[model samples]
Target: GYEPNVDYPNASHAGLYDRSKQPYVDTAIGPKTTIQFDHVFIKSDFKTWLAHNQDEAILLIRLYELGLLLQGRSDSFLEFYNNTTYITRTDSKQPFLNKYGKLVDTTSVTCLDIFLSVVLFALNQIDSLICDFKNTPWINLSKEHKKIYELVRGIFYCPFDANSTASALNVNATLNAKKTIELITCGLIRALIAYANLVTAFSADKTALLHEILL
Candidate 1:
């Protein structure tokens, strides 16, 4: 079994922090989910990864963008960190795992944070799409739209574990259609990237701060 190093000082379940007790340290803090990445590593490794793998890069970037978007909207980040269901139960069929074929522990902030990016991203998008289909049946549905529809459904509904329970349907009539358009711009790239980001974000040996740097 794998467990997150919850005691890691740079970040904990609450948020990112310097945690230094110096008497003179001012409170020039960042947002709750903010984490710092090694600038050099992100620039070099990330660029190289992108250059060689543009498809993956595009997908990851968009997911990262979605995470940032959700971060702005609500305390989704905090909820993600504190919730085990975000990981073990988000996807029904595909359990999040390590290379050793073990379950990834959701208690670690870094582990939980990475999965949160995808779970929140997926759940929100699905909710939006569901709302759109219900309200604007006249002009929104398409083969492309349906593809995304099914894919997202697969992510949340495939049922890998008992914890994968569906939330009650509550579509917002005024929800912005921008996300649907955004998803259309690159289509599958966004989906693939979002999924890929979840895996690498968790697998990387650095903190969730590294994810912020990549974004």
Candidate 2:
């Protein structure tokens, strides 16, 4: 909507790739010399990976946005944004890297990914439901819409490493910082679930919300 495309293309390009978008870059590390957002050293490499993988990258961004917003809103959640990586049940604010190790969280390995996937899948279910009524008065789900559904449910139902079990929601209360983070993680999951359901409801009758969508 803005005129950046025509006004200052170079600045726009620079802003587009600005390092600020990196999640933990803002977090001061090593006495304020290093940025410690290297989950398996992937944030730095994500742009390149995203470039090579168009579909996954797009989905990853959307998923990231979904998880980000949900966790952002809930006090029950603790995001790995700044100095405080994650508090343990011991009440120690260890560096994020040390606590969870350097792990890249794309749409594959974490609860965040599952949250995003479930959102997409629920949308798919709504579409399929609507599709059933197309002969009367129904809407259709797009390819991307359907893909989200399959991706989320597929990962959710499958068995994975123990890390998946130690999700934001399931962290132990007996452990340090467990209650605080568990609350946040659970809040994140609840928020995403609610939002996804809202979307499905909205899509149930597209014409009903056309004005809301247009602003």
Candidate 3:
């Protein structure tokens, strides 16, 4: 037996170790990152809106990370950030502000709060399912060594537009590439990997393999 507090402190560390002690006592800790993740999808009727335009939803979710988008810390701050609404009364509450310095409504009437929220939600499902990138085979190969680039090229670029409406996704596709999606998330990279994997498994009469994608 050994002191994990001392041994594991900088081990980075080990996954499993030997133990013969009673109950085989062991200790561990999780590594962490200051990096944060955000969702473009929310718990609202976001999915409901997507369903209204079934064809459009089907066309885009795969291309757009299952209709969800994730945002990084810096981007999130530029689009919407808050330390208000806290126990301390001094700071008071501050409404979320978008990139243009406009204050988002209490309900975020003119914001992508729901769109981004919903986008994020769907991507998380895809990400959670894809598990990790290392699992993907390099056979199909990616068209590009992709990043969050063109994040708004195909997807709508405005963060202040309310996309809770039924036809929003369709309209966005029509006028796609007009605006610039400034706030980007690395999750898009994973989304493409997820899509690539789906395309890879998109074979004839392969129900078992299809189930594997989601399973």
Candidate 4:
């Protein structure tokens, strides 16, 4: 309901009203106005760059974030990071190499592989004693014999090692060197289980917190 001629008495040219009624302009028309935000950037051969530096970068960032978390705590991660090598020489080919020697990669091996190799080497030193025990009588045995029996039983029943020998007569004190080795081994296994659970819980918490921050 518009009359251009009447509205403008001074009269604009007829061409003013001759322009076509175009649809709404929903797209951009001028020089593009764009924004970009990036935390880090690299301009290089992507694969080569990643192969050389990505792991190192990730480790530094992880340590940095951990440092932030432990800024005020007794166990300051920044202090630990400063004291330790952030980048280390990792020998992929020698996963089982240690002071003793290279070890067999078996199902039971982990970070404890080196220790296991030493244990095996020590066991080899006493090869005569471990030859066979099929007919060995438990009724009357030396402390050495009983110690070996307890060691085997302790491994098989880690959680119940203490209870397994609780009722036995003439059992060595807890501080006995032979018994202490079993005690420490079983304790380490339990500690590892707890450590694994702690890592699992921390991983879950980290993932959940990341999702909350990102999404």
Candidate 5:
């Protein structure tokens, strides 16, 4: 019953943007899956909501240090904006009720983005512990390494939609958003760990602390 507003410029699928118009930042931009926090935000201001989320600020800031949550073009940012989602691009807009009497804002960050910040920050640190074994190292990445990097990232970034399905697995391009399957944490981690053996085979070392991140 809840159809997306295709009329909204930002509401369509992300990666489908005209490649020539946008700058070239090589990263897989998939359908943006996000959360609907407006039901609760309808009564509160984003500023007030932000104040209650300081702990999350720490995580986002860490991402910034990694040059992830940036304003300029970068592979990670492209993948994120296209990777899996967002709301506004500014910081000073006031909240208002859109035509249907739902609260919305030009600068509001969704609950999912806030939550993913922590997960993303954690994903970045995969190399911090395993210093010799980096996870998606920002520089000089090979195609194979990138593939393994995504396998790890996919553990936490699966979107349940055709936009994602169409890009990642190349399936259901003609289909719509249907929940024929689900991403179970246990099942995901099992495959995640199984595929992680790809990295393990590169050099199986018990001291890499790979278990910490995967576990």
Candidate 6:
């Protein structure tokens, strides 16, 4: 019943241009999977949220915040614009409403770039811990290692809707899951950050901590 879609400049799927002939770059649907959070930003807002949530009692609340973001249930900046994304029956291209109760053309919703900060920061933190312990050396990485690194980092640095799916697996199952997915997601983040640190650490041993800023 709830359809979330945007109106394009043209009647059909064809893109459009402005009167001056300049292209109207459909700001409304750049990355439909992002839920348009860039549209709803309050400077220092996330930091403020974190500051108050330092207490353990409120820590889980942070998960709820994340859940809201992941679930697209929050009525924040990107609430209204017009969604070009939607879920579809895998067997067919028929679109459906996502878990957030919004029907979007999944093909139109490509990636989610906002949550990268949160996921990357967490990865860097975990990576530093393992590296400090010297659990894994700085030797060459294997195929599995490379795949893990690529997949995890891709989700962190260049995330798409499918990347979010992988991220949810890593976060919910790997790092924050009830059983823990061998800490694969968290481990990869740590490895990449450590490798990054190791490369630049010659200039400053403390550079190991730079991974924290990867967020």
The lowest-lDDT stretch of 10 consecutive residues in candidate 6 is 103-112
Candidate 4, residues 1-215, lDDT tens digits: the string is: 89865465333333454332432121212211111112111111211222234333232233233323323344543343342232665553221122112111111113323332333332332232233332343333356545554544443223567676655534554335345444445544543443344334434433544454463
Per-residue lDDT of model 1, residues 63-171, tens digit only: 4435544447455433423423453455332221211122121223444356446545754665566556666645466564565565543332326753433331123
Instruction: Point out where model 4 deviates above 4 Å.
Output: 1-175
lDDT values, one for every candidate:
0.42, 0.38, 0.34, 0.34, 0.32, 0.34
Model 5 lDDT tens row, 1-215: 56453343243335454433433322222111111233222222222222333333333333333334322436644443231223655422111111001211222335334433443454444433233233333333455444433443443325677566446644442121112112223333443343343223322322222333344
lDDT of 6 at 40: 32
Question: Cα deviation of 111 in candidate 4 (Å)?
Answer: 25
Q: What C-alpha RMSD separates each model from the true structure?
A: 17.6, 19.5, 20.1, 24.6, 23.7, 19.7
Clashing pairs in 4: none
TM-score of each: 0.27, 0.21, 0.18, 0.21, 0.20, 0.20
Q: Give the TM-score of candidate 3.
A: 0.18
Worst 10 residues of 2 by lDDT: 34-43
Tell me, by TM-score, which candidate is best.
Answer: 1
Clashing pairs in model 6? 40-77, 85-104, 85-105, 86-104, 86-105, 86-106, 127-190
What does candidate 3's lDDT look like per residue over 1-215, in tens digits? 77774565334224334332322122211111011112121222222233233433333333333243443335543434354445554422122112112211122222433434454565554444333322463212133312332343344234666556545777765343223321223445644454344333322213332344453
Each candidate: how many clashes?
Answer: 6, 17, 18, 0, 1, 7
